[PDB]
Amino acid sequence: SGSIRFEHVSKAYLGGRQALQGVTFHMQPGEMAFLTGHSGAGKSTLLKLICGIERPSAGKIWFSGHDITRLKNREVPFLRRQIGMIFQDHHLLMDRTVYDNVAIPLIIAGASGDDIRRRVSAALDKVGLLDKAKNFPIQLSGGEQQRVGIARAVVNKPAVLLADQPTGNLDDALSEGILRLFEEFNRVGVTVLMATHDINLISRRSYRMLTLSDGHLHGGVGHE
Amino acid sequence: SGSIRFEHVSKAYLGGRQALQGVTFHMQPGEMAFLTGHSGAGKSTLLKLICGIERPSAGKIWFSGHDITRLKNREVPFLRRQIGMIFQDHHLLMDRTVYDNVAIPLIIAGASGDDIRRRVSAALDKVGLLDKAKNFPIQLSGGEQQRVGIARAVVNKPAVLLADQPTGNLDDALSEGILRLFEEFNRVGVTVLMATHDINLISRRSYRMLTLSDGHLHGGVGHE
Amino acid sequence: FNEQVRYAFHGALQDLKSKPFATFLTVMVIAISLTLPSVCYMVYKNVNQAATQYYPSPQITVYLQKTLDDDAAAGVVAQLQAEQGVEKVNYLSREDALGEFRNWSGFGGALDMLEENPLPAVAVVIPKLDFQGTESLNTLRDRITQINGIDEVRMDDSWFARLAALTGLVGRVSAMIGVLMVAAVFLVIGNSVRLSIFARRDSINVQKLIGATDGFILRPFLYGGALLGFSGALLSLILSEILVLRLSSAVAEVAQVFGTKFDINGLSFDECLLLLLVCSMIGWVAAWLATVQHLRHFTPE
Amino acid sequence: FNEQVRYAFHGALQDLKSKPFATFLTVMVIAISLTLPSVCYMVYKNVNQAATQYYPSPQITVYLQKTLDDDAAAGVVAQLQAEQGVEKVNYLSREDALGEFRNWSGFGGALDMLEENPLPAVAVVIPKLDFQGTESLNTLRDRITQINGIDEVRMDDSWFARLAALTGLVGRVSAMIGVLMVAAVFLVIGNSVRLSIFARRDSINVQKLIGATDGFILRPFLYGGALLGFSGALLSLILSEILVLRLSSAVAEVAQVFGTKFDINGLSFDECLLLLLVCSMIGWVAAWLATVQHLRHFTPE
Ligand SMILES: CCCCCCCCCCCCCCCC(=O)OC[C@H](COP(=O)(O)O)OC(=O)CCCCCCCCCCCCCCC
Ligand SMILES: CCCCCCCCCCCCCCCC(=O)OC[C@H](COP(=O)(O)O)OC(=O)CCCCCCCCCCCCCCC
Ligand SMILES: Nc1ncnc2c1ncn2[C@@H]1O[C@H](COP(=O)(O)OP(=O)(O)OP(=O)(O)O)[C@@H](O)[C@H]1O
Ligand SMILES: Nc1ncnc2c1ncn2[C@@H]1O[C@H](COP(=O)(O)OP(=O)(O)OP(=O)(O)O)[C@@H](O)[C@H]1O
Numbered sequence A, B: 001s002g003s004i005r006f007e008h009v010s011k012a013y014l015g016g017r018q019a020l021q022g023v024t025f026h027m028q029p030g031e032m033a034f035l036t037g038h039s040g041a042g043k044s045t046l047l048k049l050i051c052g053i054e055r056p057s058a059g060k061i062w063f064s065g066h067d068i069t070r071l072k073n074r075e076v077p078f079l080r081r082q083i084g085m086i087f088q089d090h091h092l093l094m095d096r097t098v099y100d101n102v103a104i105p106l107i108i109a110g111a112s113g114d115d116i117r118r119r120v121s122a123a124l125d126k127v128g129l130l131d132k133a134k135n136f137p138i139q140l141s142g143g144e145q146q147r148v149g150i151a152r153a154v155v156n157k158p159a160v161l162l163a164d165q166p167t168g169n170l171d172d173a174l175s176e177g178i179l180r181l182f183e184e185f186n187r188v189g190v191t192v193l194m195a196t197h198d199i200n201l202i203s204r205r206s207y208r209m210l211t212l213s214d215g216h217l218h219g220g221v222g223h224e
Numbered sequence C, D: 001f002n003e004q005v006r007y008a009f010h011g012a013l014q015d016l017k018s019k020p021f022a023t024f025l026t027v028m029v030i031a032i033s034l035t036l037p038s039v040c041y042m043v044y045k046n047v048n049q050a051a052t053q054y055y056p057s058p059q060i061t062v063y064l065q066k067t068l069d070d071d072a073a074a075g076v077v078a079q080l081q082a083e084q085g086v087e088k089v090n091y092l093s094r095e096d097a098l099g100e101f102r103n104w105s106g107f108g109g110a111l112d113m114l115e116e117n118p119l120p121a122v123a124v125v126i127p128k129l130d131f132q133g134t135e136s137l138n139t140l141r142d143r144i145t146q147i148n149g150i151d152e153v154r155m156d157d158s159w160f161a162r163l164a165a166l167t168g169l170v171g172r173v174s175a176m177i178g179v180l181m182v183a184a185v186f187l188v189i190g191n192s193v194r195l196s197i198f199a200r201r202d203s204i205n206v207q208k209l210i211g212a213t214d215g216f217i218l219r220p221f222l223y224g225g226a227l228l229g230f231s232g233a234l235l236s237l238i239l240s241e242i243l244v245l246r247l248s249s250a251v252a253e254v255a256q257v258f259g260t261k262f263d264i265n266g267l268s269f270d271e272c273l274l275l276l277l278v279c280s281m282i283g284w285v286a287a288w289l290a291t292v293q294h295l296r297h298f299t300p301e
Helices: A043-051 A098-108 A113-127 A142-152 A172-188 A199-203 B043-051 B098-109 B113-127 B142-152 B172-188 B199-203 C003-018 C020-054 C070-081 C094-105 C134-146 C159-198 C201-209 C214-258 C269-297 D003-018 D020-054 D070-081 D094-105 D108-113 D134-145 D158-198 D201-209 D214-258 D269-298
Strands: A004-010 A023-027 A032-037 A058-063 A083-086 A160-164 A191-195 A208-213 A216-218 B004-012 B018-023 B032-037 B058-063 B083-086 B160-164 B191-195 B208-213 B216-218 C062-064 C086-092 C122-127 C150-153 D060-064 D086-092 D122-127 D150-155
Touching: A023 A216, A032 A043, A032 A172, A043 A058, A043 A083, A043 A160, A043 A191, A098 A113, A098 A142, A113 A142, A113 A172, A142 A172, A160 A172, A172 A191, A172 A199, B004 B043, B018 B043, B032 B043, B032 B172, B032 B199, B043 B058, B043 B083, B043 B160, B043 B191, B098 B113, B098 B142, B113 B142, B113 B172, B142 B172, B160 B172, B172 B191, B172 B199, C003 C020, C003 C214, C020 C159, C020 C214, C020 C269, C020 D158, C062 C070, C070 C086, C070 C122, C086 C094, C094 D094, C122 C134, C134 C150, C134 C159, C159 C214, C159 C269, C159 D020, C159 D158, C159 D214, C201 C214, C201 C269, C214 C269, C214 D158, D003 D020, D003 D214, D020 D158, D020 D214, D020 D269, D060 D070, D060 D134, D070 D086, D070 D122, D086 D094, D094 D108, D122 D134, D134 D150, D134 D158, D158 D214, D158 D269, D201 D214, D201 D269, D214 D269
Parallel strands: A032 A191, A032 A208, A083 A160, A160 A191, B018 B216, B032 B191, B032 B208, B083 B160, B160 B191
Antiparallel strands: A004 A023, A004 A058, A208 A216, B004 B018, B004 B058, B208 B216, C062 C122, C062 C150, C086 C122, D060 D122, D060 D150, D086 D122
8 A cells, every 4th residue: 555644643843843733634545635835834844754754743653554653763764765755955965976866766775787777767867867867966957956856756666755845946847847747657556745835836736735834734625 | 336247158167068158138236137047047157157156258247347257266255245145055054043144244244243133133034034043054944944045145235136046945925025025125226136937926027037048048128 | 795785885985086185194194193003013023032132131140169070060050950940051160260250350360379269160040031030030049059069149139120120110111102002093093984974974864864774874884994994004014114124224233333133023914914904993893883873863763 | 352253263162062072082082192292202301311310321441550659640530630521530549449359259359469459540531421422432532541640541442332322223213203103193183173174164165155255264263273282282281191190100119129219200381381382283274274275176266
């Protein structure tokens, strides 16, 4: 399965603000939904809880039926291995080429040398960075660095895709192309959860609309 | 004066692509214009040439009537001091509090202790981060980290404002608030040149619009 | 080798190649801090050999009864050589003692006019090193006295005790000095590897976020620390050998003045391999301790 | 203090307090690398004094004619004392020379059978300590022979050069060790500051982009480098003080055996100030060289 379930999840940072309060929702496998909210609502915190980067202060979290509320540090790397994550700051390896950045998840999975070459180039083609493979991340524009993170998150055909403003940069023409890339992955059966501020992109689709406000979640059309 | 003038400017990075080919335009002091283009068109490179960060391979650049195409390294700090620059990566000091990040332009100029406290707090109020003064930049969301850089660029009442996608993050409601903030400075007489991808934001204004396409500049309504 | 081992080694080697001068400075610092104890140890090894081989250590100087002749004195010498704490005994007759008496005085009027030789037989005994202790030599001189035909042990126990105190002091000081140099090697190698990793702690966080295990992350850093310790130790072996050649002329000159020929001995092949192997382990452990501290820092809870 | 000085000092000081253990390790590395030559200088200083004060260095011997008496010998002694390069002159009569002969022999009591003393008067002249050059001693001895009433001027010759050769060898080895210890101090302090600054090179880039001058950027790093050298040097003074006390007891037993009293001389106040001042300058220059490299790296062209 690839489902996600939240039951009264609440997260409070160490000595800081209360990021979330009583978040309760569940997502069927293969379902695509949008996450929205004002700046500082807690969209990135919600995505981090699912991936396991942060642990909730209350409530329980289920990933594919497994309880990941309190996971041992040994078991965490085998949870994030099934999740395609895109960050806000693009979290790149500045001392490695574009090819090395995209190929690292495959190496962790221990793929063969020939298969790495074919799959990496195919991923870079989907975002239009094929000729940038030999470059370093410092020699790329703001939108080009962002598209490297997207390519890295889709090489390993993950079960769940978590996107944190994947089109903050990039023009509207290129942003729609990136959205269509997630569409075809969803048709295969990948669960996609996207957080964004682009009103125009959302208005052109009809997916589930998860609205987050001051750490409180609204299910949209319904909590079902 | 706060005018900017280009004359057949062309930039080509070391061993890389020709970012700009024969850009030629000028801006009268106190006018506000938008800079738009597809990803990789060279918007950030154009702004870096004005700031003196990059030196053009050809042509001449005039800043307030002073030729800066071949400025010596000694005179550079006295040019960037007159420019309020907002970067794409927010370029923050991660080991200093939010208050210290916004106050560093004033310390360089050498303001008094009491004056710094009043001006920094006023600037953080304009972006809504007043209660975030004692936090570190790692303790802020992507939207709030972005707004810290905006506040840093408006404390020192700069003659020219260069914005590199100041609303990549932030929701639509907060994006309008930032845009209105720039318009307030423009009414005083500050020249504003902002590069953005938000076509929705531009549609609600009627300012001069500059299109950059594959390194070739188009003046929009006219080159005047 | 394993495929991931090959990947880790190439990644570790690429970092050092990326910034040449900075890497060279780190290797140079380690090399100098290792040349210092290597040279001093070489001095200690060579000085110990010369002292054991060339120092005229105090002699027992057994005195025999004057009534005994050469044949009876030789029997006493045989009894001396049969003792547990005796390595070798050399015999000098009464006339031999008279010959040394004439050499010191330089005048024959103090010995020739006597009707008989007033000097007793002298036996030179070579004591064993383990039996050259304070209590052992005291016990040895008693057993020598108990041996028939011996009436005096000319050994003084004053110069022997005085020389013993200086040896104890030099060993005490050299031990404290040697600890500081060894302790400096651990800190210099440990701190250099610790600071090198700290500049790259961002890559540790990025790899951990995409699901890499701790073992996967550690290997490139572990091999980097071992290479740094190995490279620094290897360079010092070149420096130590060079400093021998500078001192080769000086030592030969001193040996020429004394007449006796002496040659300096450098580090053996076994010691060279041990130095490389130990320094690599220090870098390996330092890299393991530094990286694990970062992996715990990025843990959410 | 100026407002820019206080802000730079406060910013530099806050960086050290941010990560205590990492700063503590860097200070400990510098402290050990400075204690090593601090103790070895103290060992050299005390040994040099003790050898000058206590070692019976070989002397110059003058033999008088057998026909002279003590009164005539004293006149020769007076002539010896007035010569340039002579520290003091000692005299031994004919009976004194025979008395020492009797004391060494023990069995030399038969000398009383002689009608007259065969040994002539012996005079001892100590050359000036700074005038003990090989050529100077021969020149002095030859000039001494010109004095009337001298039968022979005697020098140990071989023992003079042999002792001089060994001392010269100690000088070359000690000088070789001293350079290595000094070089290690320069490299350890320089490399520790260089790696510390490299981890903060992103903050240098940010300040340049917002218009900060090179002088403004340098100041926080210059004060941080000087503090590391000052903190490390100050700590090594405590370690040197402690290690003296450990060796102070040991020297007492050695002095007790010889009976004569000797005391360990530590580092004077002037030496302590010089060590603190020099190490602060090294950190200042090291922090200046490292920072200028990054400033030149971030310039466009
Ligand atoms: C890498 C550097 C290693 C340095 C090693 C130094 C070895 C010294 C070899 C030269 C002298 C040997 C011949 C002397 C013996 C002889 O002639 O023969 C032995 C003589 C007496 O015999 P004779 O009366 O027949 O001449 O002994 C002496 O004259 C005095 C004893 C000399 C013993 C010296 C041993 C210690 C020397 C330490 C010097 C190095 C100190 C380094 C700083 C701590
Ligand atoms: C920081 C720690 C430094 C320690 C330094 C200690 C110096 C020696 C202190 C004790 C010396 C007492 C000797 C008294 C001599 C006497 O009374 O008597 C002096 C006698 C002769 O006079 P007498 O017949 O009257 O006794 O001389 C001797 O017997 C031999 C000469 C001894 C001179 C030794 C000087 C060098 C010692 C070096 C040891 C340290 C080496 C350190 C490693 C390189
Ligand atoms: N590391 C952190 N430590 C403490 N508080 C944090 C941390 N990260 C975020 N916060 C706080 O948690 C709240 C929500 O932050 P979060 O990053 O989840 O927001 P977001 O919805 O992604 O917002 P944005 O669109 O501005 O990026 C804010 O009050 C923020 O200051
Ligand atoms: N430091 C650099 N070295 C080499 N090439 C660079 C560098 N920075 C940018 N480039 C290249 O120059 C071109 C323009 O880059 P620039 O950053 O100016 O784009 P941009 O218009 O800001 O784009 P975006 O929408 O991605 O932010 C691109 O081809 C980019 O890869």
